[PDB]
Amino acid sequence: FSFQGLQISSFANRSWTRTDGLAWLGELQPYTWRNESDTIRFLKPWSRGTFSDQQWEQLQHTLLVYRSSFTRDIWEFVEKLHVEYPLEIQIATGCELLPRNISESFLRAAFQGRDVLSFQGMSWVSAPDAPPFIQEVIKVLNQNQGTKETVHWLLHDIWPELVRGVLQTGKSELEKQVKPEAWLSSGPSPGPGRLLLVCHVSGFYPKPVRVMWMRGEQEEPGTRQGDVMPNADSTWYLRVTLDVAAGEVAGLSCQVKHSSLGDQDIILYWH
Amino acid sequence: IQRPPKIQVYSRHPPEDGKPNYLNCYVYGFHPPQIEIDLLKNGEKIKSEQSDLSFSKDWSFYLLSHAEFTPNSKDQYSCRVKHVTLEQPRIVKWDRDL
Ligand SMILES: CCCCCCCCCCCCCCCC(=O)N[C@@H](CO[C@H]1O[C@H](CO)[C@H](O)[C@H](O)[C@H]1O)[C@H](O)[C@H](O)CCCCCCCCCCCCCC
Ligand SMILES: *[C@@H]1O[C@H](CO)[C@@H](O[C@@H]2O[C@H](CO)[C@@H](O)[C@H](O)[C@H]2NC(C)=O)[C@H](O)[C@H]1NC(C)=O
Ligand SMILES: *[C@@H]1O[C@H](CO)[C@@H](O)[C@H](O)[C@H]1NC(C)=O
């Protein structure tokens, strides 16, 4: 279960900007930070981790000063470099705990939907093939010792200590297993004398899963995987389809493999 | 720079007429993040909930909008999506079968 802190910043004109934050641990969202709010919100009882109220308050103050400063600082880069409007900036930052004691952290960012810069070891490094001016934004950002120090601390002290504690408090919820329902339906016609067999699987946690159309032990190819799509309760949904002649439909089944079931797959025959 | 929304609609549970359920409309792969997602019963907006906006590895956004509903014989459902890459609001029908 890796940790990802996520920032979405919209600068439309100069009177109107918003910055939103949220954070994922594994598949679950333990934090949100709405523009309207001066404080992060804990979405789960385990969200607070092992951090004390003081550590949380300090981390908050830093981030709140950051958000304010980020806002005005972008606007200055905008006016003093005549960049376009609107602007969408996103930032992703996080880490994961690897075996032994090694932990790798990161902070990359995006301008207009693609990579633009990141943070490597001790300094801001620009991303290959990026708009002309950001090499010059990188110039300024590298002359701000304080911000560079604060980022380093965050990535190397704060995220790892936060994730260790939240991995502990959230263990039972993170590692839980929810069994899927499954059901069959006849879908839109692929042609005269054809059927679209549709197997639906819904309500499994976690996300890795395997759903195939079968004839005995031989997997039917022609099986088209849907995307795995979220439900509101942090479970998932997937539909898997088969374009088959209405004649050859007998003996077909849909088999569902999921970590929650063991070696006891769900099996459904077409009736 | 600019990506259009992909839209999928599906119910939470097997869709049995009469039994309360959840209708899900999943909008993803888009950019800019500004978007509007309405769930419609027979053309009319219904009370729905939206998750926090988020994004994937490649910086494109996604959003889950869900609402309670009770499917039956007559009523038809759909999802309406307005985005800057769509000159007319895009509409996607709920197909119980797919
Ligand atoms: C818990 C879930 C919430 C999710 C939150 C998402 C995580 C986002 C990452 C957090 C970044 C943390 C960095 C904090 C460093 C910081 O405070 N930077 C601030 C604050 O500095 C201010 O206070 C300091 C000390 O108190 C100094 O005195 C400064 O002079 C003063 O200006 C800094 O000034 C400035 O805002 C840095 C901006 C970073 C921008 C890098 C992002 C790349 C965007 C590139 C966009 C391209 C340009 C478009 C025009
Ligand atoms: C900054 O941007 C917002 C739109 O992103 C503008 O707000 C709109 O302004 C019109 C006309 O005044 C209002 O009727 C709308 O209700 C607003 N829409 C939204 C989505 O906010 C705002 O006018 C812009 N301001 C400047 C100074 O350019
Ligand atoms: C969001 O927050 C900022 C800073 O607190 C505020 O000044 C601004 O008006 C807000 N933006 C929007 C779009 O509501």
Author numbering:
A (entry chain A): 8 to 278
B (entry chain B): 1 to 98
Give verbatim lines from the article.
CD1 is a family of antigen-presenting molecules that is structurally related to major histocompatibility class I (MHC I) molecules, but binds and presents lipids, glycolipids and lipopeptides, rather than peptides. The overall structure of boCD1d is very similar to that of other CD1 or MHC I molecules, in which the boCD1d heavy chain is organized in 3 domains, α1 and α2 that form the central binding groove and α3, which non-covalently associates with boβ2M. The glycolipids are bound in the hydrophobic binding groove that can further be divided into the two main pockets, A and F. While the A pocket binds the acyl chain of each glycolipid, the F pocket binds the sphingosine, leaving the structurally distinct carbohydrate headgroups exposed above the boCD1d binding groove for immune recognition by cognate T cells. Secondly, the conserved disulfide bond in human and mouse CD1d that anchors the α2-helix to the β-sheet platform (Cys166-Cys102) is absent in boCD1d.
The obtained structural information encouraged us to synthesize a shorter form of αGalCer with a C16∶0 instead of the typical C26∶0 fatty acid, which we also crystallized bound to boCD1d. The crystal structure of the boCD1d-C16∶0-αGalCer complex was determined to a resolution of 2.4 Å. In an attempt to decipher the structural basis of glycolipid antigen-presentation by boCD1d, we determined the crystal structure of boCD1d presenting C16-αGalCer. BoCD1d presents C16∶0-αGalCer in an untypically tilted orientation. The only polar interactions between C16∶0-αGalCer and boCD1d is through α1-helix residue Arg79 that interacts with the 2′-OH of galactose, as well as the contact formed between Asp80 and the 3″-OH of the phytosphingosine chain. Loss of the intimate contacts between the α-anomeric galactose and the helix is likely caused by the exchange of Asp151 to Asn151. This otherwise conserved aspartate residue on the α2-helix (Asp 151 in hCD1d and Asp153 in mCD1d) is critical for the presentation of αGalCer and related antigens, by CD1d, as it binds the 2″- and 3″-OH of the galactose in human and mCD1d and substitutions to either tyrosine or alanine abrogate iNKT cell activation (and data not shown). The structure further reveals that asparagine, though similar in size, does not form intimate contacts with the galactose of αGalCer and, thus, αGalCer is presented more tilted at the opening of the boCD1d binding groove. For human CD1d, the bulky trypophane side (Trp153) leads to the tilting of the galactose, while still maintaining the two important H bonds between Asp151 and the 2″ and 3″-OH of galactose, while bovine CD1d (as well as mouse CD1d) has a glycine residue at this position and the lack of forming the equivalen H bonds with Asn151 in boCD1d likely lead to the altered and tilted αGalCer presentation. Firstly, the shape and size of the boCD1d A’ pocket differs when either C12∶0-di-sulfatide or C16-αGalCer are bound indicating flexibility within the A’ pocket.
